[PDB]
Point group: D2
Chain length 122, copies 4
C-alpha cells in the first residue's frame, strides 16, 4: 500500500529512513545513519510490490544507499531486502549487505551482513 | 572507474542487466531473469559511488528489482550489493538477498542468499 | 568461558539447544527445532574461542546441524555463526545459513539466511 | 555421493582443507588459511547428510573453525554451509559467515559474508 509504506521510520540503532511509495512500484527518499563513516543525509532509491497478495502476507521491497553525499564519502554501499507488514504496529523487517570498495587482494573481506527492524512514526 | 558501468551485462545464469549510470550516483535500467517465477523485463533502480578512491580499489554499488510487470507478479524482490572493477575485462561481483512476501509463521524462511558475477560477454 | 556457554538455551521460535563447551575449544550437544521438516533431536558439533579477550568483547563461536536423525531426513544442513555475551542476561546472537541438497539447475535457490538469538535457562 | 568428501581440498584463495567424513555424518580435520590473521593449522569439526536423495541432488554439509591455535588467537570463528557434488570433477560450493568478538557498540559490524568453492586441485 503506498500509503502504508510512505512515512518516517527508525531502526534499533537510532537511524532515520524517510520514504515515499509511488503508484508505479518506486521508492525514493533519504537515510541518516547513527553509526559508521557517515554524516548528514544520503539519497536512497528502491522498488516494492504494488499489487501484493490479499491475505496476511507481507509486501516485498528493497532499497539502496551509496554512502557519498556533499560532506563525506565512505566508498561503500548498503542494500536492504525485506517485507512490510502493516496494521496497528507496522514494521519493515530486513536483512542487509554492506560492501566497501577494496583492492582485489582484500575483496574476500569486503562485505558485512546484518539485520535491521524499522518502526513507523506517526 | 566511472562510465564503464553503463552497458549491457550478463551473469552466469544467462540473465540480462541493462543499466545507465548517472554522473551523480544513480543507476537505472531493466532486468530479465533466466530462472524463477519471472517472464520478460522488469524495472531496476540503484546507487553507486561516483567519486571512488584513487588507489586500486573497486567501485561500490547496489540495486533492487521488485518482480512484478505486466505479465506476472511473483510477490518478491531481490537486492544485489557489490563492486565494479574495470580494466580489460570488467566485472561486477555481487552477493544478493531475495525476499518473498510470507505470513508471519513463515517469515523465518523468507530470504534466500546467493552471489552473481556479471561480465559484458 | 566453558561454564558460561555450557547449558540449555532456547531461541525465539521455541527451539532447544543443549551444549557442553570443552577445554580444548570444542562444542558438542543436541538441537531440537520447532519449525521445518524436522522431528526429535539432532546431533550438533562446533568450536569456540577458549582464550577470549579480557575486555567487554564477546566470545566468537559457531556450530553445525545436518537434519538427519533415525526418524527423518530433510537433506539439508544449517550453520550458526555468532558470539556469546555473558553476565546476568547472557545471550548468544547469531546469523545462520541453511543449505538444501538440490539438482545443479536449482542450486541458485539452495540457501536461506536468517538470524536467531538464544537465551540461557537456569 | 558419500566417501568422496574425505580428502584434501583447496579453495580459490589457496587455503587447504583436510577432512575425514565418518559413516554416520561427522566431519573432522584441519584448515590452513592463506589470508587473514592466521598462521599454521587450525582444528575443524562439522556434519553432512550421510543418506542423500537418489535423484541428481547434491549432499548438504557444514563446518566451523575457531581461529585460535598455539601460535595466534584472532578472536573470531567462521562457519561454511553448502553442498558436495561428486563426479569427474567434484566440488564443494559454499557460502560462509565470519564473526569476530566485539563490544556491543560494534556488534552491527561483527559479521562478514562470502562464498568459497573447493576442488581437489
Ligand atoms: N542504520 C544502519 N547503519 C549501519 C547498518 C547498515 S548500513 C550501516 C551504516 C554504514 C555507514 C557507511 C560505512 O561505514 O561504510 N544500519
Ligand atoms: N539472475 C538471477 N536470477 C535469480 C538470482 C537472484 S534474483 C533470481 C530470479 C528470481 C525471480 C522471481 C522469483 O522467482 O521469485 N539471479
Ligand atoms: N531453530 C531454527 N529452526 C530453523 C532456523 C534455522 S535451522 C531451521 C530448521 C530447519 C529444519 C530442516 C529443514 O526444514 O530443512 N532456526
Ligand atoms: N579460506 C578462507 N579464508 C578467509 C575466508 C573465510 S575464513 C577467512 C580467514 C580468516 C582468518 C582469521 C581472521 O582474519 O579473523 N576463506
Amino acid at each position: 500500500a503506498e500509503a502504508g509504506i510512505t512515512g518516517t521510520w527508525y531502526n534499533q540503532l537510532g537511524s532515520t529512513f524517510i520514504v515515499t511509495a509511488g503508484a508505479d512500484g518506486a521508492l525514493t527518499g533519504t537515510y541518516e545513519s547513527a553509526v559508521g563513516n557517515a554524516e548528514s543525509r544520503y539519497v536512497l532509491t528502491g522498488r516494492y510490490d504494488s499489487a501484493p497478495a490479499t491475505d496476511g502476507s507481507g509486501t516485498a521491497l528493497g532499497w539502496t544507499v551509496a554512502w557519498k553525499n556533499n560532506y563525506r564519502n565512505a566508498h561503500s554501499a548498503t542494500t536492504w531486502s525485506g517485507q512490510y507488514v502493516g496494521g496497528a504496529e507496522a514494521r519493515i523487517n530486513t536483512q542487509w549487505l554492506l560492501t566497501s570498495g577494496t583492492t582485489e587482494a582484500n575483496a574476500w573481506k569486503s562485505t558485512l551482513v546484518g539485520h535491521d527492524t524499522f518502526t513507523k512514526v506517526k
